[PDB]
Design a protein around this ligand. Structure first.
Ligand code: ADP
Length: 356
């Protein structure tokens, strides 16, 4: 049983994703994504061992026949997914990077002497790291997993395979209070001007928290407007909106299509409707009522109604989100909203392991 991610952090949090080159994991079809994890000797969970990109069906090399059933087994690339930690926790960030680099050296030895065999639950030579295997029905093989023997590969990581995920208190988005917030607010889809715009529309209104209301408005409006922009750009079917009704040819499979996700650059990972919870029933009604016209002044009635309704009923920006993450006091937890850096920017490069 792989431990679930911790959901609570006192302040801003960081998670890292790292797709490996030089090997594959082969497993039965419809297998769980997680097959193991690496923890410290003290028991702290550092990262998960996951299958990532499907590379086709697995064919056991004839010279490695072992009387075992490998029927319908699929081959996938490996991705190392960290357990989130506090962004300012240097020790936690460093242990994750070192633990990933150690596992790469272990994999390099494994494809050399135990090619086409499962990873065994072992402790590192220095005692720092422990592998726990949660799905024994797997094998690790060099390159593409077609040949019985490797090409003497050194298992590496690379920025092309790297992502970072940052969690921040929802109430902080638009305040620019910290360098994380300012980095997130630099997302091209985020329109800061919408804050002062909300203020102008709501002068006669007695708002419970007008500055929080303006922050939520700018955040949600920015997401809604970008979704519409992307739906028009890529010809995405949103709710009942048909891109072909507006002579737009579909050129993506949906919101979760890698190219649509890449177009966000800083991808929201939390369900937009969750942010309404940080406001009073009254302030939320005020924020929500002002969103429709921002869509309707830039997009058709159909695209505007459909994007608005989609996010109202709990629609996700790009598939299942991270919606149970929290910040602040453990006893009175506040909503955390998460963002995926599709490409790791220079400001976040220090959180990522670098093959020596
Ligand atoms: N509270 C959090 N703060 C920051 N990052 C988080 C948090 N919870 C999860 N993440 C991160 O989310 C990233 C990947 O999310 P994941 O659900 O596994 O991706 P996907 O489902 O799209 O394959 C990891 O880097 C992980 O650490």
């Amino acid at each position: 049983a792989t431990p679930d991610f911790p959901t609570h952090f006192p302040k801003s949090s960081i998670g890292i994703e790292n797709e490996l080159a030089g090997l594959v994991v082969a497993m039965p079809a419809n297998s769980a994504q997680k097959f193991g994890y690496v923890k410290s000797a003290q028991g702290d969970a550092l990262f998960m061992l996951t299958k990532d990109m499907n590379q086709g069906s697995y064919q056991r090399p004839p010279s490695l026949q072992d009387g075992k059933n490998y029927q319908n087994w699929q081959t996938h690339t490996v991705e190392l997914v960290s357990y989130p930690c506090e962004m300012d926790d240097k020790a936690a960030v460093e242990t994750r990077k070192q633990a990933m680099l150690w596992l790469a050296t272990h994999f390099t030895t494994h494809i050399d002497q135990s090619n086409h065999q499962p990873l065994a639950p072992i402790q590192s030579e220095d005692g720092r790291f422990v592998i726990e295997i949660t799905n024994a029905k797997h094998v690790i093989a060099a390159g593409n997993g077609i040949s019985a023997e490797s090409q003497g590969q050194t298992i590496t990581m690379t920025p092309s395979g790297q992502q970072a995920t940052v969690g921040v208190a929802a109430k902080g988005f638009g305040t620019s209070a910290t360098p994380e917030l300012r980095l997130l607010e630099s997302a091209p889809w985020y329109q800061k001007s919408l804050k002062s715009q909300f203020a102008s529309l709501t002068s006669a209104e007695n708002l419970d928290d007008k500055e929080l209301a303006a922050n939520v408005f700018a955040y949600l409006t920015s997401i809604y407007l970008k979704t519409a922009e992307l739906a028009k750009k890529f010809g995405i079917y949103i709710n009942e909106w048909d891109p072909m009704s507006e002579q737009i040819t579909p050129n993506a499979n949906g919101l979760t299509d890698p190219k649509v996700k890449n177009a966000w650059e800083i991808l929201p990972r939390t369900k937009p409707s969750k942010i309404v919870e940080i406001l009073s029933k009254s302030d939320a009604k005020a924020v929500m009522k002002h969103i429709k016209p921002q869509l309707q002044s830039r997009y058709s009635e159909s695209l505007s109604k459909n994007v608005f309704q989609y996010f109202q009923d709990g629609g996700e920006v790009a598939g299942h989100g991270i919606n149970n993450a929290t910040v602040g006091d453990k006893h009175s937890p506040e909503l955390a909203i998460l963002f995926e850096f599709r490409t790791v920017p220079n400001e976040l490069q220090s959180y990522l392991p670098k093959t020596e």
